[PDB]
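quick one if you have a minute, typing this from the bus. below you get a single protein, a line of residues and a line of whole numbers that encode the local backbone shape. could you go over both lines and see whether the tokens make sense for that sequence. anything you notice is useful, everything is just below.
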Amino acid sequence: GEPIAKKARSNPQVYMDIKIGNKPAGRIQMLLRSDVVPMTAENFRCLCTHEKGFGFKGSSFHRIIPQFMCQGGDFTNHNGTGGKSIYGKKFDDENFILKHTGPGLLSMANSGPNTNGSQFFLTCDKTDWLDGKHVVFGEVTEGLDVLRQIEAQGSKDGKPKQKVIIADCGEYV
């Protein structure tokens, strides 16, 4: 009822422990922008904690293209075709407020408008041609170094050179 300008709502921090080949490679830490995209952020956060009975743990980065991005999140079919959200098989594009301004951003993979599930990518470049098409919803705050090691397993085509796996994942406090 009353005119206001609301405070930024609290932003969850999440993490992913990464395994390359079958060798711990370390932890990526991510800030999720609930302040801009709370529906998209809550999905990803749940999928990190496994609190709904399903999520990213044990899934892989199945498509890694260097100088571009690392894509992952298929925990249902484990072949790059699957995934689901906490809201259902797919959900809407919340908004496109955040842009693909540079490396180390989290954005949702999709197969057209309003087809988000669980599959996401981490940028390795300014991928601004994806602005308005993929919902950006977070950023890496630690372990850019670990993401580079994921990127170094990429091919031009996308097939990874070694298995890259989310061995464990979660939310900070």
